[PDB]
Amino acid sequence: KVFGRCELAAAMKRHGLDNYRGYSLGNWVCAAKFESNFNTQATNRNTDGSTDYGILQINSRWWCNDGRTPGSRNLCNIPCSALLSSDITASVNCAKKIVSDGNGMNAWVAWRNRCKGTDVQAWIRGCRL
Ligand SMILES: [Cl-]
Ligand SMILES: [Cl-]
Ligand SMILES: [Cl-]
Ligand SMILES: [Cl-]
Ligand code: NA
Numbered sequence: 182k183v184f185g186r187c188e189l190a191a192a193m194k195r196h197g198l199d200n201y202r203g204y205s206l207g208n209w210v211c212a213a214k215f216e217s218n219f220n221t222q223a224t225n226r227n228t229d230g231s232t233d234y235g236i237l238q239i240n241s242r243w244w245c246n247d248g249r250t251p252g253s254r255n256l257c258n259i260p261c262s263a264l265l266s267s268d269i270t271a272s273v274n275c276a277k278k279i280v281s282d283g284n285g286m287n288a289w290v291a292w293r294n295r296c297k298g299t300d301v302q303a304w305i306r307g308c309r310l
Contacts, residue, residue: 182267184219184236186210187308189269194310196273202280206310207301208292209276213237214304215291221267235264237272238289244275 184192190210193199199206216238217223225233230251231242241250245261257275264272279288286292 182221184213184221184269186214186219186304187310189213189219189236190305190308190310192269193273196270198273198276201277202285204280204286205301207304208286208296210304211296211299211301212286212289212292215295216289221269221272222265224265232261234261235266235272236269237264237276238291239264239272239275239279240288244279 190206193209194206198204198209213219213236217236219236221236223235223238225238227233229242230249231240232247232250233240234245239245241247241261242252243254244257245259245264246253246255247261257278259271259275264275280286282288286297
């Protein structure tokens with residue numbers, strides 16, 4: 182599934198991400214836009230043996246089990262397959278755990294490169310939330 186921008190914003194809001202751990206909702210929409218282009222099945226393989234999964238490109242070394250990554254900790258206790266679902270529930274549940282590390286949203290490459298420090302409220306412009 183490829184989410185619409187405000188479609189995704191609404192779902193993220195329903196799941197409590199607005200201002201979670203100090204990140205207003207637009208940070209999360211921006212992260213999804215630039216990590217995955219809002220695609221729930223986005224998957225990117227890294228040379229390090231890990232894979233980034235789903236709309237938020239969550240990495241398989243520390244957060245989900247794909248059965249093939251070195252240093253696996255599976256701290257969200259889920260198959261990485263769950264992070265490829267068309268609904269965002271597993272990805273948001275896991276994201277709340279990831280952002281609770283001292284890293285915060287720096288865990289997301291694309292957030293660090295295209296969202297941090299910007300006008301992230303623009304990503305929820307015209308969403309009526
Ligand atoms: Cl939902
Ligand atoms: Cl915002
Ligand atoms: Cl899996
Ligand atoms: Cl990570
Ligand atoms: Na990632």
